[PDB]
Amino acid sequence: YELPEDPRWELPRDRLVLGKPLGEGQVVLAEAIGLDKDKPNRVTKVAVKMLKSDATEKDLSDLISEMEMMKMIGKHKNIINLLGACTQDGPLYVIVEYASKGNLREYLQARRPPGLEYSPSHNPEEQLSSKDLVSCAYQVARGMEYLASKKCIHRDLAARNVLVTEDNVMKIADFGLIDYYKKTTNGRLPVKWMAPEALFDRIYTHQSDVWSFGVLLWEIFTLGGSPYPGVPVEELFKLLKEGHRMDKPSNCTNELYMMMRDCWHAVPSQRPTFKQLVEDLDRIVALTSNQE
């Protein structure tokens, strides 16, 4: 309730115009007036995180901790950035950048090629080239390399946790933040993104996020495909113990599949780092056709 004031980040409440809910604590779309010192007269569309009415002191401490972590990490183009907070005289609001094109999974699926008689009415007004897909991978690797340089371990890197802005910029999110059988809102199992050592030994490192990044690359090249569809938790454990790896998606180069497979090295020390992935993806982007 009574939080201390951080003038670096404090935005007066009368400057924030709460709008439609974006997700559910809970996230709402809002308009911030004079978020920056100049101009005090410009409105910026923002996303506001707040607690729900049924929240406890632990939920408040979690929101505070998340806001505190975002302050420490600092700004990067490929992460959802903290813009402000309302901590005084009312509920805590954590104001962050708004990504109008939703999560990367939704973004990719909406840009899938048009429906056919064997699918047949998916008629997108939006389409992605091969260069655009490698660009998404590069931007996510860049956000992750930055987070890694700030000693941050994501633990849930997946296309659902990557947001897309109006300018098509990839931004890593978290929803700064376990039941293996718990499914996402979309009905998918997060264990399908977890490195075996994180899954079986609860060892979380940058190497285990690199494993998750390999699953994220697979999600990109299948245009929002669902990893291991119809595979329950127990069968997934068995696939990992057998050293099973997902097949190469169609419209994926041998080079990019080799990258996915490298991210999925059984030995964590042998996986590429985010620094190596950013360099390889930088070179690959430049050589990838935008003609198809």
Ligand X SMILES: Cc1ccc(C(=O)Nc2ccc(CN3CCN(C)CC3)c(C(F)(F)F)c2)cc1C#Cc1cnc2cccnn12
> Where do contacts with ligand X occur on this chain (CB under 6 A)?
22-23, 27, 47, 49, 66, 69-70, 73, 79-80, 94, 96, 98-99, 102, 147, 152-155, 163, 172-174, 176-177
The distance of closest approach from Cβ of residue 103 to ligand X in the complex, given in angstroms and rounded to an integer, is 7
The length of the chain is 292
User: What φ, ψ does residue 75 adopt, rounded to 5°?
Assistant: -85, 135
At closest approach, how far in Å is the CB of 157 from ligand X? 8
Q: Three-state SS for 258?
A: helix
- Residue (80 or 220) nearer to ligand X, CB: 80
Q: What is each CA distance from 89 to 25, 94, 164, in whole angstroms?
A: 19, 14, 33
Catalytic residue among 132, 156, 174, 262: 156
Q: Give the phi and the psi of residue 61 in degrees, each rounded to 5.
A: -60, -35
Nearer to ligand X, 137 or 172 (CB): 172
Q: For residues 4 and 1, give the distance between their C-alpha atoms in angstroms, rounded to a whole number.
A: 10
CB of 291 to ligand X, least distance (A): 31
**Active-site annotation holds for 156:** yes
For residue 6, the SS3 value is coil
In this structure, the number of other CB atoms found within 10 A of the CB of residue 165 comes to 15
Cis-peptide into 39, omega within 30 deg: yes
**Residue 31 to residue 41: CA distance in whole angstroms:** 12
* Residue closer to ligand X (CB basis): 98 or 218: 98
Nearer to ligand X by Cβ, of 66 and 284: the residue is: 66
For residue 190, the minimal CB distance to ligand X (Å) is 12
Cβ(132)–Cβ(77) below 8 Å: no
CB of 259: closest distance to ligand X in angstroms?
A: 22
Query: Closest Cα to residue 174, out of 273, 93, 96, 274?
Result: 96
Q: Would you please indicate which residues are annotated as catalytic (active-site) residues?
A: 156
